[PDB]
Assembly symmetry: C3
Homo-oligomer: 275 residues x 3
């Protein structure tokens, strides 16, 4: 299904389950799509929820609009989906870049009384280095990623999931070509332009302010061996800044743990949601 | 192209060939799409037919609707496509789950005087074991498939075509990465929920009644080494229940024979159809 | 986005950049899509251009219409895109089959005064061997490709990019699975019938008349180790037929040079366009 945003973007989304069942809205990471949530969507459907997941603008099946690739637009696009379906008050779950999107959404759209939120290996508070965040990674790494997206996206989208994303580069770890390919697939159908700007969006946006204002219960799930988003600089700090945040640490887990450790993550996610 | 069903589902379809040429409507298997018919579509176009192939609900490019994943809905979706294109009286060819769809369609929509039908490695009469079908497979096997679709669909959709589907697991057979990849691709663009429910639809639906009522000529094709749909409990029985049915057995052929043995299957399909 | 043609075909296209910026329209090769221009689109966006790229009928995301798979229709489809977006007078860049499409467009749609054009490893003047073109390739070669598309498309679409297309079959050249898979991917989402007929369209259409009539500045780029479109019977001859055309030779370069040698191809395209 599709919804047209205020600025004319076509946002694709999946909406499964009873119309009146409690809702969980899932927000995917960079440079993926709603297809990255298969395991979670089926698990929560089987546990009584209506599940919704949309493709970020320029990602997956959503329109490849060339501009507006920043957290504020991402958040407003979320607002469009929510209002379109009338799913205000839903629980919002965000992975990686999607976690930033969730936080920014809960910050600029308080009119939507979101029940609870879950940040899984999310980018907040900030990934880039600034005088306020000296622990932020150097742009050179991000600028480099943008160069890869611009000059060899097809291979770069193989390298990321085949190496650091799922921890398949660790010793004794058996890689899954299906999982690698699906990551790659979701990336290739998206816009190179949206993904290019998207790196600035998830790496150079400061969510410190937003985290401090969120009063709802928020669970932060982070693997201590996350090679893409810093466990301490992002996860631990995020849980600390959130007034009602709680941290859930997973030893040795990778960035893509919701896929490679679906059972564990889903069970813990459900426990938190049911309070 | 798309047709909107009575219940609001968008069904994607392909329609190639002269508008007034005789029609062959192809029905794909689980968990694929109309793209799985490439070889047949071009073969029959070259042999004077108009060919139509649609994506089952929640499969390929069709709407990822969360419910209605059963044979009755699959059949009514076919009716929508047929009515939209005005292709009543066509020949219908179904592969695997698609074979069950063809049978249910003919049964629920007798108004459409289908000319003939071909069931290839099709699921009828009933795949699962029950008190009425002692020779079927235990439900646990299908529950296992559902579990795979629910927790590791991306790899599972590699395992099936790389192993049992095309017989590539048979020592000595040369696998095709392109064919494996295309199977996987069609599966991944479809809905995990549609595929999850779809397993129950194809393995636990009894088509005995539908088969007994089909009076048109029907050809049942089946490889005797089908690792996906047991030859003895499907093709053999379906052919006998069909009043005007006939069985065509292919020794050593896999479930996906229409793809790996296109020349032979296309030639035999044509002989029966034309 | 999409535009509906006169004959009811849905043509998918990408349109990126400031609405008021100078336009460059890219035309992809067989059996690909607009996604094949990733590297070029981002490079020109960075240089202040508005870039447009559409999927040929029956290719990529465009309608899998069963007929009209010939150069005249491809050209009329271009006309529909141009009129829809109001991008008359833009620069047109076509690769391989796309090169033929550009030339046919500029010929049957003179009302649009295209500024300049670039033909990269383009099919003109005529690929197949005929009495008038004794230096062409025997038709049997193209009949072979058609048979592969009809009975072994999934694997054939792996073989072409893994072998001759990018020169990965040359000694000492390392292949990119991501690039091979992306070529394969774009081909599989397109129509087998459109691709089957498309072989006749690109290999047996004579563009001599069109070429002799184009007065605009045109740059003909061609690698001399192109295993898909013979250098000597294409680019060399096309450059001479064009009243204001010039040949740019890339020694040892493959057919898919815009992808494997993006830095060089982009720089030369930019220099020519602003010349």
């Amino acid at each position: 299904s599709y919804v047209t945003t205020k600025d004319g973007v076509q946002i694709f989304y999946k909406d499964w389950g009873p119309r009146d069942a409690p809702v969980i809205h899932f927000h995917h990471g960079w440079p993926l799509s709603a297809d990255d949530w298969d395991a979670q969507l089926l698990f929560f459907l089987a546990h009584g929820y209506r599940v919704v997941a949309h493709d970020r603008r320029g990602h997956g099946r959503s329109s490849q609009v060339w501009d507006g690739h920043d957290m504020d637009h991402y958040a407003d696009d979320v607002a469009a989906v929510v209002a379109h379906l009338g799913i205000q008050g839903a629980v919002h779950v965000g992975h990686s870049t999607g976690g930033g999107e969730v936080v920014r959404y809960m910050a600029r759209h308080p009119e939507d009384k979101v029940a609870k939120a879950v940040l899984i290996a999310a980018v907040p508070p900030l990934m880039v280095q600034t005088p306020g965040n000296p622990g932020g990674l150097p742009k050179s790494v991000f600028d480099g990623f943008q160069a890869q997206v611009a000059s060899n996206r097809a291979q770069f989208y193989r390298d990321v999931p085949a190496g650091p994303f799922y921890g398949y580069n660790r010793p004794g770890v058996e890689a899954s070509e299906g999982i690698i390919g699906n990551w790659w697939r979701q990336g290739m159908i998206g816009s190179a332009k949206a993904h290019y700007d998207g790196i600035v969006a998830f790496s150079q946006t400061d969510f410190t302010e937003d985290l401090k204002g969120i009063q709802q219960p928020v669970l932060v799930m982070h693997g201590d061996d996350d090679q893409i988003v810093p466990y301490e600089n992002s996860g631990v700090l995020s849980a600390k800044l959130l007034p009602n945040g709680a941290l859930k640490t997973y030893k040795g887990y990778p960035h893509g743990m919701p896929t490679t450790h679906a059972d564990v993550i889903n069970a813990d996610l459900l426990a938190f949601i049911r309070s």
